[PDB]
Design a protein around this ligand. Structure first.
Ligand code: PBY
Ligand code: PBY
Lengths: 325, 325
């Protein structure tokens, strides 16, 4: 039922976008079908984690507060596809980083996906009192993610910024705002229960869960084999400010830091294996267990503070926290 | 006075954006000063044609309709920098088309410039009744420009689309909406005289002036020498659907079209000179004079229809039409 409606609203959104291009933007069928295929390729196929969270939050707030039900659930599905389209926009921008027409189309497709989030919001929410507030928080978080990518890209240029606090700054703006806080807030807005929740506890929860997932994501990028990860680990070669790097630099000797700096950020197969050897020989994945258990304990506590004033909202956050844990 | 205030509001806008990053987004001084230099490099230096049009329209409507004056003129300057920032966003996206960090920063800088148009609008216009309508028309035109770039990039893939009507479709969405119609509309919105103008005549004027400038721009891209153009002409090598190409294909023989198709879209110095030879030997720049005179006559007529209901607005359009003519 949740996924079956989420895909049904996708058909309704796509039909509006493509018909608007044909009827209002004077687009020929060849380019309409091309944009249909590009939309299905970049937006469909994933796990829809962010989009389904919006639907999960809106369900808990209408059942725990009738034509109002159909309106809120449909609005949540549109907001869910706004984030899914925004993630597709981010994925296209990543493909560009790594008279050529296929690059011109990739750049143009990234801008179209970003614009489609505005068009589907201006259309389905034209008669909603929260349209202006929804677009403001949406674009502010998109601005936050771009600022977060600047911290992540320039984390090794200006090892001075390889600290745990700066790691939290990167995860906060690069991941935590649009992956965890944005879907929760969009669920509160379509349910019109935005002023009925403690946003401080909610924001603090999103940062903790965002940081928890990133530490697990950094370890998998290093030790999980390529076939079991769905990609090829590249944080070592890219000299990324990962949780493993900042935790190593804090508990290593001068030679181990010297050997780390002489091997980190290189593409040689044996210099990367030397980095992994330094990670293994420091019992870092022992610190990984305790660090994650400490964060998970902080997640359980903040959910209870949020339930005293918003019970049904915390139930949907326990579901979101389960999909990460 | 017009430029002196336009640059003064730039300082006010930049100070808000950079302080917000320092105070709210936890940005260090090194990256704040970096974004200051990137902002000044991509946004300043140009002619500010689009931005100054917003100020030109707002002046004519308040004088021809007092703390209301300072509010409208300041709002027009902010809207002017919204388009100037949007143009800087488009210019950065063009540089990308033609672990490398300088490409990561370019892509990120393009997204930041686009987001800064939203942030400066959400801040200075937070208490304005037109904020939601301003953002909607702004993003819809940005979506229009991206659709226009798809028509221009794919104009030679699917010479079937090398027609005069399709040329008008490209110029309409790629150039005419955000270069001529957008600054005029933003001047009407900050002056709150949006429902007091014939938008059909206004839209038709922007398309005619946008198409007029593009034909002149296409000829200069071909015949104006590189030092007198500010760039290097590349429409022939890129196989662009220029006004010269579509006008040539309509009045050429079978061999001349065959020789055109065998030389167009190539980078050879002599194949491009063969294309220019075919353009010269067809008296195309004779058709250029008559075509531009016909468009200019249509511009003079539509201005008079618009003055019968909006006199002061037409005076600012005669000034904008003078900067193209
Ligand atoms: N001078 C320019 C540049 C430009 N760039 C642009 C705009 C929207 C989307 C994409 Cl992919 C590129 N569009 C029109 N005129
Ligand atoms: N998986 C991703 C991708 C991603 N891309 C992105 C977002 C904003 C700006 C820029 Cl330049 C790139 N950001 C976070 N997570």
């Amino acid at each position: 039922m949740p996924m079956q409606m989420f895909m049904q609203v996708y058909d309704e959104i796509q039909m509006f976008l493509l018909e608007e291009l044909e009827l209002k933007f004077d687009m020929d069928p060849n380019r309409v079908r091309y944009l249909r295929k590009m939309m299905d390729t970049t937006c469909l196929g994933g796990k829809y984690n962010r989009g389904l969270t919006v639907i999960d939050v809106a369900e808990s707030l209408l059942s725990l507060s009738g034509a109002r039900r159909k309106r809120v659930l449909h609005d949540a599905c549109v907001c869910g596809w706004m984030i899914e389209f925004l993630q597709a926009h981010y994925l296209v921008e990543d493909d560009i980083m790594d008279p050529d027409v296929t690059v011109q189309c990739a750049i143009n497709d990234g801008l179209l996906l970003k614009s489609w989030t505005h068009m589907m919001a201006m259309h389905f929410f034209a008669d909603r009192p929260f349209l202006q507030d929804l677009l403001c928080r949406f674009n502010r978080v998109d601005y936050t993610t771009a600022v977060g990518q600047l911290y992540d890209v320039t984390s090794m240029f200006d090892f001075a910024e390889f600290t745990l606090s700066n790691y939290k700054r990167i995860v906060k703006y690069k991941t935590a705002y649009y992956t965890y806080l944005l879907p929760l807030v969009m669920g509160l807005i379509v349910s019109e229960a935005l002023p009925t929740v403690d946003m401080g506890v909610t924001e603090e929860l999103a940062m903790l869960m965002g940081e928890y997932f990133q530490v697990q994501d950094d370890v998998m990028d290093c030790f999980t084999p390529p076939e079991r990860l769905g990609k090829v680990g590249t944080d070592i070669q890219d000299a990324k400010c990962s949780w493993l790097a900042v935790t190593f630099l804090a508990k290593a000797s001068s030679a181990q830091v010297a050997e780390f700096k002489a091997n980190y950020g290189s593409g040689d197969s044996e210099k990367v294996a030397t980095v992994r050897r330094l990670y293994e020989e420091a019992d870092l994945q022992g610190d990984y267990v305790a660090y994650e258990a400490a964060v998970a304990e902080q997640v359980k506590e903040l959910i209870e503070k949020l339930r005293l004033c918003s019970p049904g909202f915390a139930a949907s956050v326990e579901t979101l926290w389960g999909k990460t844990y």
